[PDB]
Amino acid sequence: HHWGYGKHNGPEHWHKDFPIAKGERQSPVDIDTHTAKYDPSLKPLSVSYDQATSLRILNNGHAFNVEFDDSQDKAVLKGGPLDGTYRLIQFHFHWGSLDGQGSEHTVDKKKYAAELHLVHWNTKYGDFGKAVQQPDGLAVLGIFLKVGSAKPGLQKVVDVLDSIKTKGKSADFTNFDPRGLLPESLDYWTYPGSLTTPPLLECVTWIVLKEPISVSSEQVLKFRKLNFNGEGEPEELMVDNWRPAQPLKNRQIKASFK
Numbered sequence: 001h002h003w004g005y006g007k008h009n010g011p012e013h014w015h016k017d018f019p020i021a022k023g024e025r026q027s028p029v030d031i032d033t034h035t036a037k038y039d040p041s042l043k044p045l046s047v048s049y050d051q052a053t054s055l056r057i058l059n060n061g062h063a064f065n066v067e068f069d070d071s072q073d074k075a076v077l078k079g080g081p082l083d084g085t086y087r088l089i090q091f092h093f094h095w096g097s098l099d100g101q102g103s104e105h106t107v108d109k110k111k112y113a114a115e116l117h118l119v120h121w122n123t124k125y126g127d128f129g130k131a132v133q134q135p136d137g138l139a140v141l142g143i144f145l146k147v148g149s150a151k152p153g154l155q156k157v158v159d160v161l162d163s164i165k166t167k168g169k170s171a172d173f174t175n176f177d178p179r180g181l182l183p184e185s186l187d188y189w190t191y192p193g194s195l196t197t198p199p200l201l202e203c204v205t206w207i208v209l210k211e212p213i214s215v216s217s218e219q220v221l222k223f224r225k226l227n228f229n230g231e232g233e234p235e236e237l238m239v240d241n242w243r244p245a246q247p248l249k250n251r252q253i254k255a256s257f258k
């Protein structure tokens with residue numbers, strides 16, 4: 001058996017193999033917008049993706065990852081709450097079976113249809129596997145998706161999903177520009193947290209953008225045609241691959257904006 005998002009292996013079970021699931025800085029969380037304090041000392045985010053090199057897209061059985069060449073400083077996140085340089089390694093999404101759920105973070109308990117995670121690692125630790133062992137090892141840029149108008153920059157991702165339907169499938173995915181997934185504003189909330197899947201390591205500076213991106217109903221319907229299963233196995237649609245909000249405990253969510 002293995003962790004997943006089913007009735008028998010979902011988030012309420014993860015603590016049995018990953019006891020840090022009940023830890024002091026777990027993600028995601030509810031963002032209470034009235035309780036978040038504006039921190040005028042936070043810097044604007046610097047998102048430098050013009051030289052991003054996408055390589056491949058992979059169905060890992062839990063989501064799909066768009067992977068980048070992170071062997072050099074090609075696509076980096078700096079500024080905001082961060083010290084130093086964080087290199088883009090991959091992005092992925094979490095989404096629902098219906099439009100009223102799917103995001104991992106919530107905003108005043110509102111769930112969005114989906115959530116994009118752009119995963120970056122702190123270059124002072126040399127590699128991703130070292131960085132996840134450190135409290136400031138990762139920076140994940142989270143962007144909410146709502147259903148409305150299509151996102152034109154998402155369609156190249158949507159159109160390749162039929163080629164990676166099942167767990168373990170990958171496809172070449174070069175020249176994808178992740179700037180096409182951003183909203184107009186880089187206003188954000190930030191707090192110290194964790195990976196939202198096992199192994200749930202407490203290594204993430206979360207940066208969650210206030211402005212959602214709009215995607216079309218047809219775009220998210222295509223995410224929901226993916227499979228958790230491998231080829232030839234009984235079909236289990238890849239939907240509701242989100243962890244619910246965890247206790248905030250002794251943490252403060254800071255806002256970049258008034």
Ligand SMILES: NS(=O)(=O)c1ccc(SC[C@@H](O)C[Se]c2ccccc2)cc1
Pocket residue numbers: 001002003004006007008009010013014015016017018
């Ligand atoms: N999250 S975790 O790592 O602590 C973990 C590890 C192992 C397990 S046992 C899971 C199995 O009993 C049942 Se799957 C099933 C459900 C419906 C239909 C067919 C088969 C659960 C969670």
Ligand SMILES: NS(=O)(=O)c1ccc(SC[C@@H](O)C[Se]c2ccccc2)cc1
Pocket residue numbers: 117119128129132140194195196197198199
């Ligand atoms: N949803 S999320 O953005 O918080 C997120 C981001 C990245 C992951 S990578 C999970 C595992 O494949 C790699 Se952890 C590992 C890697 C090397 C050595 C030890 C442990 C998980 C969740």
Ligand SMILES: [Zn+2]
Pocket residue numbers: 092093094117196
């Ligand atoms: Zn994620």
